[PDB]
Symmetry: C2
Subunit: 208 residues, 2 copies
């Protein structure tokens, strides 16, 4: 087997999600911030390129407003080194940006996703990556969601994050812990991916 | 102003009904019936109808080329259509002419029906939004299956609800088939939610 050639992308780790008005609720945000930092430190030690993504909305916007505290990168990011930076104003870190080219220029075959939110920025970015031919990894303990209620119904942060983690594992990404990822980097091994048939069979077999 | 819609009917194949990937929520007869209604309402209004069929290789457990499971369900195979694409990844854009065909017909709004909510439908919607299309998702003309894998468990109800709520928060106007039919007959758009509102309504359940 070929050794995975990973890039770690740290998506929208900004104060809005922590001290601001879109507070991450599951996993616990302090626990995911700590794992983001471990993943970044491990990546730097192992020579895995680290890409920071920052999301902006216009000045005066209620969230992620240019010039506001909430739009600034959290100290976990800002006090660390990085190898690349991408600003975005859409969920996906690829659309219209230099990300795909930058990755390709570094022979990246595997994009390891951390940051926020699981169901929006992270999932959009992963969807683009998968359909471009990249393998994707998702660190379930270095990511997270918020609860939502709207005309379509209610879903908690735990339900959103779990659903997305399980769906990702079924088809789109290797879902793993930060500890698991760090070890796989050390060993030069891929992380395990699930599949739709196994995933649905297991749930059905249990219901039986 | 009046949307220029196309209705896309994704992967309404026997695998999901009589085969080995049975849709569990919403009830599959109820969503098949609504897909039928939506197609007929589109037809009557001159809204174009696009059919998508997903194939895996001959001999695969699901969607195998040559198998009954891979065939379109008669609800859809016996009806009129304006366009057809076959695909082999979740998004109906990747490796198909879909974006080109929609562009040639000056489509600005894509209405999504068919299966699965969290896989083919979500991936198609995420591509469409990022290409600049407006998207609608008919929550009673779509559906999910349960999954269990190394990332955890989630039921079909949880998966469909979580994706319906997340889509309403940012990616699509989520509506019932009746609401869509009324919007087509009236030449009006459907309502979209937003992330900040969705999160604020959920946070109010704490009742501090
Ligand atoms: Cl698995």
């Amino acid at each position: 087997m070929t050794t995975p050639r990973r890039a770690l992308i740290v998506i929208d780790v900004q104060n809005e999600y922590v001290t601001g008005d879109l507070p991450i609720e599951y996993p616990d945000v302090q626990s995911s911030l700590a794992n983001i930092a471990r993943a970044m430190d491990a990546a730097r030690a192992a020579g895995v390129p680290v890409v920071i993504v920052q999301n902006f909305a216009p000045a005066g916007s209620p969230l992620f407003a240019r010039g506001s505290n909430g739009a600034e990168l959290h100290p976990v990011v800002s006090e660390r080194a990085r190898d690349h930076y991408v600003e975005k104003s859409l969920p996906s870190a690829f659309t219209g940006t230099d990300l795909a080219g930058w990755l390709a220029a570094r022979q990246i075959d595997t994009l390891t996703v951390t940051g926020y939110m699981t169901h929006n920025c992270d999932a959009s970015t992963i969807n683009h990556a998968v359909h471009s031919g990249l393998a994707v990894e998702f660190l379930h303990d270095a990511t997270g969601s918020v609860p939502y209620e709207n005309s379509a119904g209610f879903a908690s942060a735990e339900e959103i994050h779990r659903v997305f983690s399980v769906v990702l594992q079924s088809r789109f990404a290797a879902v793993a812990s930060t500890d698991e990822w760090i070890a796989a980097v050390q060993g030069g091994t891929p992380l395990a991916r699930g599949n739709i048939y196994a995933s649905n069979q297991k749930a059905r077999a249990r219901r039986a």
